[PDB]
Amino acid sequence: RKQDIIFAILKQHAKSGEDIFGDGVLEILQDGFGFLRSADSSYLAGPDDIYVSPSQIRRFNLRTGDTISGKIRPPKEGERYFALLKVNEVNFDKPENARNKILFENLTPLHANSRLRMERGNGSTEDLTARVLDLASPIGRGQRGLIVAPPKAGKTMLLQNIAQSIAYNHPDCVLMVLLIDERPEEVTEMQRLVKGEVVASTFDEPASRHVQVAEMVIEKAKRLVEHKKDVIILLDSITRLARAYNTVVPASGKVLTGGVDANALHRPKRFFGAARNVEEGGSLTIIATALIDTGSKMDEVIYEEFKGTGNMELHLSRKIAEKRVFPAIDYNRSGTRKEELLTTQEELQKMWILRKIIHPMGEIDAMEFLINKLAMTKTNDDFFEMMK
């Protein structure tokens, strides 16, 4: 109802002669034209979307994901969308700065160089999760990891803790938590808890909207990276997204074990590998949560295929989660490749000694030891100094 009221108000205001302003993310269709979707509707096709002529797209070399803000006009007799007259701001910047840009496909990838420390530093009991995460698997800019965990392991609490630690330590980073095929109540809870942008697509609509929202989000992330921004995407839907792609892919006659199409894992693997660290400027970090032991062999095949792709695995133990010990992290199975590029020599040596001491002990025993050692102090520096 609000959209029709705004439409009528804008019409009455344009009848007087005043200017009308709009904003939205561009979604170029296959025919050549596009529309400016809205953020409050999770990039959903609305009746009051702003039409974008192909002439302006050719003039400014606009692509899917470009945030466009400019003057619009109400539709005339025979039109159903707002025509874009003049664009004022492109991607929160002037068009003269966006015209001389380098495409995302030409950026040179690199390994994680900058250290994104997750430790809060306030000495809270909730900071233990971030401390264990930093001790087990340090995360840097451009990291491409996977949160491997069975159902009912603590993915929600761990994701909330990660989001809060990111918003606390690194408020300059653009945090985007894209939740696909999840409960609406959980979406509402997350949106009113984390300090950032929350786009979601619940199961109430088919997988086409899921794929469309995923494409819009990845295009916006690529454009922001092109504009020298540090984008961090926490997509806890990678398994759901792979299921959606396998459901919407045309049959090719080559079905793998478990009901997986031969060309179904192409789009999600490309979405995952899109994350990379750019040397010219900016980075893209994608932390996804994979589902295992869900009773379906399709998810097992998806996990086994995506295991050889990322460079960071955070395994969670079902036993430790059932014992109500959070975070229930499998320290032995966790780790990060090329960790010497994110940690110093002494920090790497301390982590190596801690792993050599923890490995002989059992999972529950190692977790109890780590908790008892971290409870004695507030910062990990005192723990490191006492271990020696």
């Binding site: 050549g32 002439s55 050719r58």
Partner: protein
Amino acid sequence: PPDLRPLVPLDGGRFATSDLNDLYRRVINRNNRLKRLLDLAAPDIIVR
């Protein structure tokens, strides 16, 4: 309406399409071409 100008159902992938459908397709093609060319601001000779 499409029922008044239907496609003859015959065996095989080919179809002896009605002349009216062919004319409508040609008109739609020639209209979409001009619609996409008028936004590009082509020279006047090509437009004419």
